[PDB]
Amino acid sequence: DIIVRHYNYTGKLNTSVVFILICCFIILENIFVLLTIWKTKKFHRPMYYFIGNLALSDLLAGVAYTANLLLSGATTYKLTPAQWFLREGSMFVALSASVFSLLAIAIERYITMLKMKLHNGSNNFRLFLLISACWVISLILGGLPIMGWNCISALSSCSTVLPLYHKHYILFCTTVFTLLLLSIVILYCRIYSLVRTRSRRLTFEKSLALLKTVIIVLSVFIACWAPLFILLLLDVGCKVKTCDILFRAEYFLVLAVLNSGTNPIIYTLTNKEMRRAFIR
Template identity: 35%
Template sequence: MAMESSLWSTCDYSHNVTFFYNLVGKKISVEWESRDVFVIGLGLTVCLIVVLANLMVMAAISMNHRFHFPIYYLLGNMAAADLFAGIAYINLMLHTGPWTSTLTKEQWYIRGALIDISLTASVANLLAVAVERHQTIITMQLHSKMTKRRVVLLIVCIWAVSIIMGLVPSLFWNCECDLDDCSTVAPLYSRRFLIFWAVLNLLTFFIMVAMYTRIFFYVRYQISHMSQHSSEIRHRQTVFNLMKTISMVLGAFVICWMPGLVTLLLTGCWAKTATPTPTRSSVWS
């Protein structure tokens, strides 16, 4: 029994994608079903809308000199991350269903890495915007005094961290050397990595929500106790309106991603571990 368990944890890189799906009991469609066609058609349509919408946002920020401030550069970078997410999901739609079994492990890892990179970049951008707004609005300013050079450096760091996080599963934190740790959601990923990734993103969400909640109530308090000078009223109302817009963006993002992250966390924590069976053993070759 100990020898069998040892073999089950031995690194063997000859397994294909189908092996890992069979291992965790996740079915790969053999033929196209009407549901598959509908999901892919709807998914591609939504992804194209996301790509076009974010291209318009990036173009508007680039061409309008009134938006050449740190907060708008960060929002533009967030649009770039969302555009990248749209492209990542287009790639997913074109490599899912019956096509999954034709993927090499490298192609499968690339498919997952693109999604990981886009989500990490979006979350990191939202966190950067939250920190920038907190620093700026607590002093009741409309725009940050951060230099363009620092903003560019921050954006580069965001993408560098995102790319690293996207490459982690394919480089070393996967279940190819520990088949008991394979995830039912992403069969080649380690369940421990998915738990770490979900907890990290959920923790970031809670931090951002706490920061925006503090800013929101602070601004409301300041507006209710400020003088009646018209220029001061307009300035603070502009700040408040900008905060409401950013808060709605954050709220929509959290609502869209929270269910998936919670699902990843629960699946990673309570999913059954894979155990070798005769049917699975037949796939080893």
């Protein structure tokens, strides 16, 4: 009743195997990273804990998309509205947790590179606070539509890609994503800037390698999260039954899950010690 009407008013009325295989490969990579962190004793420090949280978030993102991937299809009409909301909130929570894990990694790196120190040690308070924030905020952000911030009783203000989500909620999520992406970019840019200035301050490389790493990370993240962001911005501006590009948005979320799957690749191959631990 709700699903059929909301999809009819958004133009939807009624290739997965390769995506499921990619998700399984992502799950395998995340499990490999997690076991590599767990085995090695010198990895029991907060930074590698942040990488482990990133790996776990990517693992849950792959599991969620796999699930979403499986559930969607003609079977999406079988789901009750509450079940639909749970299915979509799974993806939203997983992606929010992943990107917030990137934010937490960037924040920890910025704090470490700001206060130079000599032995950073284990600052468990900051670690626990960051992990708890990145999890709770992600869960709440994925849960907003189910408490009532949805398209129901607001049909004239209804989204197209998610015909049971409120356009204002999608605008809020887009604003949060913009703020978080700019935060990550500014944090990494400031890290590189401070490292380069301090490296030029002393007279007798590190700066070039850091620039290469930062460029790789940022280029991958932005160039792989861009199309989904563009669609999340465009669906608000598109009138219903008009924008044809909005219909085939599955590949544009495939891109996001590939970014989730290439996060541990980047955070492993870049790190010398990570590769030495993984090979041995």
